[PDB]
Symmetry: C2
Subunit: 251 residues, 2 copies
């Protein structure tokens, strides 16, 4: 239908692939007309890539350890940024005129195809330092130039936070002060860590939930008997999509 | 110099007056050309009001328990909102064409007179729910109409958070989506609770620190010997301004 535009995610191992499988499924459940793309590394097992193919339209291999990879010389300068340099390959996807990147620890709650109305770089405020955008969800335009500039920046300065958010905020440094249309509503990237009164009032309209913190949805022990985890509706939802929609897909 | 414009704060008791005394002093140290105003309630002791007069140009009494007060009928509808209705009297100060309200648990680190370049309602994002502004610091235009509309809102709906921030966000509900110039940089209202890598990179430019959480700067036990508290440079600064600049003022 809309071959020109895609949601793009990233899996660097089989654990995160379970995240991507749930994200992908949630986009399908809310009936996106866009393509679904996952960037995968060789650390993702062949059998998991086959599961990824049942949900994603494209499973695109990216290996920054390969000397043919465009980011490989940058990795040799910044060996701590392998995951970040892999994610930044989202800008190499020049077969698409516009994409929404979503981290594999997000979950979609309603159709968010109206994000394609936005322009690069559109993103929600990060809680905690709200003059930085959160890099879990963003609208961007693939470009080899932009990609190479991003690699240059990573080369010169690394990332002020060790991951992709620092570098993307440093690159797209006008976000906080320029054009409010580039501020996605917080409900398009609602932090699981995120002000209870604000949530009582605004939470029902959540469109995307972003599972932050060290413990990811797929590393909870889920108990099918009780439909519950050991340690809430979003985490329960995650597991619902996984058990109900993902598990029966490779058969 | 600039009789038309003011910084405005609020003290509902003697504890908070110590906050206001420090805020006021910090505005003076960074050489504001504007007036300094404190709204005080009768719970503030006469002797503390006299201390407040050594720092503030105007100490303006507000008593919502008085039946002559404009908010008194609203208080009878919402008896839990006395402090909030007192703060909203900042909009009654029609002798001023433009003001910056600052909670008494803020501290100024550099001249912020360039806030008078902004228009109502300008405010920084709240961390945690960043599509709401934080109500600790905001640029507004005094108006009896605006004030009465605010009282009406408080009457009809109360405050979604129990304090002033809910109601001000509900009233000024276009803040998140309209005119980025109404987004104050986070450095004009930097949460003490506020992302360590972001602070390493951005904290040096802090212009206002906002002491959040249940334990206020003035309720720490300060030890003059060690220049330290029991439980960091901002809290130490607070105490420095208090001991050095405030204590010698009533003599
Ligand atoms: Cl704008």
């Amino acid at each position: 239908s809309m071959t020109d535009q895609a949601f793009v995610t990233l899996t660097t191992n089989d654990a995160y692939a379970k995240g991507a499988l749930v994200l992908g499924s949630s986009l399908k459940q809310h009936r996106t007309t866009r393509r679904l793309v996952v960037l995968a590394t060789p650390q993702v097992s062949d059998s998991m890539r086959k599961v990824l193919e049942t949900v994603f339209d494209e499973v695109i291999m990216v290996d920054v350890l390969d000397s043919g990879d465009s980011a490989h010389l940058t990795l040799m300068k910044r060996p701590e940024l392998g995951v970040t340099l892999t994610k930044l390959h989202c800008w190499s996807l020049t077969q698409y005129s516009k994409c929404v990147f979503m981290d594999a620890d997000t979950l979609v709650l309603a159709n968010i195809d109206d994000l394609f109305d936005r322009e690069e770089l559109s993103a929600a405020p990060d809680p905690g330092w709200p003059d930085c955008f959160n890099s879990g969800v963003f609208v961007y335009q693939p470009s080899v130039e932009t990609y190479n500039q991003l690699l240059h920046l990573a080369s010169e300065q690394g990332s002020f936070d060790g991951g992709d958010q620092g570098i993307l905020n440093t690159f797209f440094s006008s976000w906080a002060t320029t054009d409010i249309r580039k501020h996605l509503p917080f409900i398009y990237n609602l932090s699981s860590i995120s002000y209870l009164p604000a949530f009582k009032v605004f939470g029902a309209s959540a469109k995307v939930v972003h599972f932050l913190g060290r413990v990811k949805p797929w590393n909870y022990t889920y108990d099918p008997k009780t439909k519950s985890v050991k340690s809430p509706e979003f985490l329960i939802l995650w597991w619902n999509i996984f058990t109900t929609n993902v598990l029966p897909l490779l058969q």
